[PDB]
Amino acid sequence: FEFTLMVVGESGLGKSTLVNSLFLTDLYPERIIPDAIEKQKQTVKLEASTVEIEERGVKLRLTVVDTPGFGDAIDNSNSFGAILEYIDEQYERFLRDESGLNRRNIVDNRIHCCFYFISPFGHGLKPLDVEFMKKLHSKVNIVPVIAKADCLTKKEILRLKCRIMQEIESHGIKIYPLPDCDDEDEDYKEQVKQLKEAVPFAVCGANTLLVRGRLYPWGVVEVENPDHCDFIKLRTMLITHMQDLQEVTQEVHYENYRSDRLAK
């Protein structure tokens, strides 16, 4: 494999903690966290970090492309301007290398999937969330993720899940769909059925072993436990859908960018 994942969201949503908690890694050493004095006009930069990881015989080269500074400025206008240019750049790099007379070894840096994180503190999708997803759902597979699920009770999780699903339906956002299964397997058909009913995945990230979880004076949040958060469902969906995510990136989004650019 050679999979590329993009992470987008406000700072302080546990994104770095989540992407680390997936394959139990540490992609962000010496993480420079700026202060509020240098964040009012902090532009959105793109910093990639590729990591090797073997998952039950599935050895893959995971390249994570974070977008530090998204939605942390006073005026978040054109915050998603650099994210757009990078994705189209990777499509252009692939279009140049595929059209050239020497395509023996090509670096495939196209973004196959893009996690977008939603703050659980508010009531639903914010204008920054809507104007981002609508401006990128036709170029990359958007996967909505409710960050920091452990601040929402049972009733609050189902309330926020259903609302931001209506707002996605209302604004016409094309998030990444999970493919339907054919008879085939019965247990796998039940697993993919609960994945469709759990989206948007309200997840929790933690690197502390206690069996990963978070410690509170009133209790312990079990990350790997589905009854507490949808971490295991997001991780399971990622591994089982890396093929489809890669294929839809090539056969759909890339081909649409190709046809659009060939007329320019």
Partner: protein, 262 residues
């Protein structure tokens, strides 16, 4: 009655109205606000409870626009409007200050998102525009989102960033030697990690939040600083807020207008 005016600054949904119901043990009119509001505005309601005439001034639409540049005028213009209303009442020849309704904001609770890092850029700019206008009490809204290990480093970065930008926050009076020891640890736990809840869980009837891994007791000091935030409701602390509002903030605005008026 005791005219105490509170202003809740906080992003939409951070639990401003929930904490007010939790703190006064009642249920104020608390309709939610959507994230689709073109600009930050203020909604103020008046209530007569206990006996005091409470005025809660909430921030409607805060931190939702994509362009949050001009999201400070409506706050400052309101706080300056109440100062001008009190000042113009003084200038009146046949004035009635005893029956005049003092609508000046005495205390202002700032709800910080429980991100864990520090203050957003919106937080620093908003507090530096109001540090010379109102008594600012910063709190960490939805404090249960943060563990006690992270909460230690969080209050560290918050206090550090505030005292590095020269943001004048409110401190509780230590002049009285009796309240000296209690208001010492009181000021030492700012920002108050607060958790608001209107639901009750069986215990021996108690305000708490029910998670599948535990229950967060709002009135438990080891869970949250709500027990300490409730200390601002005593008569001496409320009087100190009104004292400082008129002695420092309003008198500053009064000396400004008297210069402009020549």
């Amino acid at each position: 009655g005791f005219v105490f005016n509170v202003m809740c600054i906080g992003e939409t949904g951070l639990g401003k109205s929930t904490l007010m119901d939790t703190l006064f043990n009642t249920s104020f009119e608390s309709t939610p606000s959507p994230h689709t509001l073109p600009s930050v505005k203020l909604k103020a309601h008046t209530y007569e409870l206990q006996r005091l005439k409470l005025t809660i001034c909430d921030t409607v639409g805060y931190g939702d626009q994509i362009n949050k540049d001009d999201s400070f005028k409506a706050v400052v213009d309101y706080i300056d409007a109440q100062f001008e209303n009190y000042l113009q009442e003084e200038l009146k020849i046949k004035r009635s200050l005893v029956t005049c309704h003092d609508s000046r904001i005495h205390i202002c609770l700032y709800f910080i998102c429980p991100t864990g890092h520090g203050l957003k850029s919106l937080d620093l700019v908003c507090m530096k525009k109001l540090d010379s206008k109102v008594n600012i009490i910063p709190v960490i809204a939805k404090a249960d989102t943060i563990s006690k290990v992270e909460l230690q480093r969080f209050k560290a970065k918050i206090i550090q960033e505030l005292n590095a930008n020269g943001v004048h926050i409110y401190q509780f009076p230590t002049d009285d030697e009796t309240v000296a020891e209690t208001n010492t640890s009181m000021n030492s736990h700012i920002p108050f990690a607060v958790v608001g809840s209107t639901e009750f869980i069986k215990v021996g009837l108690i305000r708490a939040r029910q998670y599948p891994w535990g229950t967060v007791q709002v009135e438990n000091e080891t869970h949250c600083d709500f027990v300490k935030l409730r200390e601002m409701l005593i008569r001496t602390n409320m009087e100190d807020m009104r004292e400082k509002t008129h002695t420092r903030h309003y008198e500053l605005y009064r000396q400004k207008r008297l210069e402009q008026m020549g």
